[PDB]
Each structure stands twice: as C-alpha cells, then as structure tokens.
Design a protein around this ligand. Sequence first.
Ligand SMILES: [Mg+2]
Length: 134
Amino acid sequence: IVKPIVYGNVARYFGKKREEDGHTHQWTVYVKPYRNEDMSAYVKKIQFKLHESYGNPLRVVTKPPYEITETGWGEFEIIIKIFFIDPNERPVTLYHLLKLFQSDTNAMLGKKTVVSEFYDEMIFQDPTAMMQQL
Ligand SMILES: [Mg+2]
C-alpha cells in the first residue's frame, strides 16, 4: 500500500548570463521512485505544469525517467500530477518550487549546482484490485 518517491529539481548556473536568452541556469524537475523500480508498471503519465512563460507549459511524460530539462532565469511553482493506470485510483498532486538561486553561504564557496528534492510516499489505503500490481 505505500510507494516511496523523491521529487524536486536540480539546477546549474551557466556562470555567465546568456545574451539573447537572458537565461542563467539549466535545470531538471523530476519524480523518481526512492529506489529502482519501473514506476510505469502503475503510472499512466506524469504531468508537469510549468510556468506559462514556457512553450507547451503542460509537459506530459509517459515513460521513465519522469524528468524535464530546460533553461531559465526565474523561480516558480511546478505542479506535478501523477495519474495511475487504473483511472479509478485518485491522482497524486505535488507542488514544488523550482529553485535556482543558492544561499549566500553557498555563493561564497562558488557552488554552481543547486538541488531541491524531497522524499514523499504515495499511500494507497485501499487500492484497486488492478492496482495490486504495485
Ligand atoms: Mg558545484
């Protein structure tokens, strides 16, 4: 009944802002299981709703890795929605802040990489008969 997951984003500073992009970072938002497993056994698709400044702001992934790589210059909230192969099982929605800018302690070491990830657990209190292929 309990499937653990890690979700969030990693990001890296270009080092110098790009001149006709304005972009300063490469980043990846993602959902992965806590340990290796094929989520696609039970995940139909994962939706990432990105900031509307992006094109095709709704990004749907149907096969792992459930991740999206992109470039940008601002921080914003990403809505991650996980739909299951049985539609009668309720989808799981997570909210994540795409983090790009590091703290001052970390700027002064000169770190180019930030990561903002969180462990979570998808709970199936009384799963579908079919959902017992989990
Ligand atoms: Mg670094």
